[PDB]
């Protein structure tokens, strides 16, 4: 609540710059690793048949997408979906049990 800190808003500005820099760093590293992965694939591809090419490139793609979805929160959106669905069935269970608790007062 100070004058030097602008009531906490200056250190908050620096925190946010830090958080944005760190996400930019993570996405940059992902970008470079994804492109270097494709070169590794191109280097190996010569000695591999189509099924072996697809197995190797699939694991490299699987790796990139898993990291991307951790950075952009798509991993968490997929979880949110499963949990929201589970919640709308549990709500249907409580409605019944509340009725049976109501009627069981008789």
């Amino acid at each position: 609540m100070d004058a030097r800190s602008v009531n906490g808003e200056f250190p908050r500005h620096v925190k946010l710059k830090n958080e944005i820099e760190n996400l930019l760093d993570q996405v940059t590293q992902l970008y470079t690793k994804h492109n270097s992965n494709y070169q590794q694939y191109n280097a190996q591809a010569g000695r591999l048949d189509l099924r072996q090419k697809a197995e190797y490139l699939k694991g490299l793609n699987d790796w990139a997408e898993r990291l991307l979805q951790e950075l952009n929160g798509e991993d968490v959106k997929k979880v949110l979906g499963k949990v929201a669905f589970e919640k709308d069935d549990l709500e249907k269970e409580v409605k019944e049990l509340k009725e049976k608790i109501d009627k069981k007062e008789k």
Partner: peptide
């Protein structure tokens, strides 16, 4: 007032072994 952010973490572990090679 709060201290600065800590230093970066350690690099991650190496990835898993690749598939078996061709014949």
């Amino acid at each position: 007032p709060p201290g600065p952010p800590g230093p970066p973490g350690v690099p991650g572990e190496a990835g898993p072994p690749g598939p078996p090679g061709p014949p």
